[PDB]
Structure 1
């Protein structure tokens, strides 16, 4: 799609010049996008997962895997092996198709949107942004949603540093806070 073509033709040659790499193989790319929904109210409500899956299914376009509890935790009333979340890993076209829709369409629909933060890099050039409403995604219908619930969206990149990752994401339409 347009963003993959934009990456190869425009962004990657620019980053080569920008950072003055020896090889084109050094140019940072987006590896994968992991979308996570933590669903701790699955402890209480059994159908919370079934719903949360269905939302994430349409948003991403792949069937999510249902994550389970690594430990029992008393504070949360969590037992080991309980379904308490759902992730989906996006690579290739399904990744760029998603990331295009995120930037082009969904992040505009965020209520009172004033850019995504410049702080939210991990220190090694991976970006994570927290969505609050699943209503922003155009596949999600307003009427069908009952329980409102957000998600984490990890953008993993081959950038070693934040400034290299920042550049790549800025070169994509991603609206960083001015």
Structure 2
């Protein structure tokens, strides 16, 4: 645990009293966290698809999916059905553990981390983190790390507005 109790006992009641909601479960909730790779180099490196798949299994036990091109493109030498990137959907204790690991290690481990972007909101109440380093937190085995292709994290919340999502994230510990 270490996050579920903290949430239910500090974020939900405080945020509910702050926003004057008419019900208990009207408080916005973090539904899921989607991690996308999107490596497009597979055209030139067929084995690159294997990369970020063995790394994602260690980042989170949930094995990623080998997403395939839904449309072909000549500018990128693409054909429909060819593998591109990777997808992972964390729902349950997995997303809580991922948030804990992130907040505890990844952000403080970054060398020049200061005032994470505030405009990363999608305008509806969802947050996205743009990672450009492949070795952010310890489960990536710096020694075995060869490529530095970062990651793309998508935080999804039931928030109907961006202000309440910002408040929820700040109270959770997102160092804006």
TM-score of the superposition, structure 2-length normalised? 0.97
Query: What is the alpha-carbon root mean square deviation over aligned residues?
Result: 0.9
Contact 1:104 1:173 in 2 (8 A): no
Deviations 1:82-125 (A, max 9, x none): 11110100011000000111111111112311132111111110
Extract structure 1 runs of 4+ deviating beyond 3 A: none
Distance 1:148 1:112 in 2: 17
TM-score of the superposition, structure 1-length normalised? 0.96
Name whichever structure is richer in helix by fraction: 1
Distance 1:162 1:91 in 2: 22
Contact 2:134 2:147 in 1 (8 A): no
Name whichever structure is richer in strand by fraction: 1
Matched, 1:72 2:52: no
Contact 1:30 1:157 in 2 (8 A): yes
Alpha-carbon shift at residue 134 of structure 1 (Å)? 2.0
Contact 2:125 2:159 in 1 (8 A): yes
Segment drifting more, 162-171 vs 57-66:
57-66
Deviations 1:15-45 (A, max 9, x none): 1011100001210110000000011001110
Distance 2:115 2:144 in 1: 28
Q: What is the count of residue pairs matched by the alignment?
A: 176
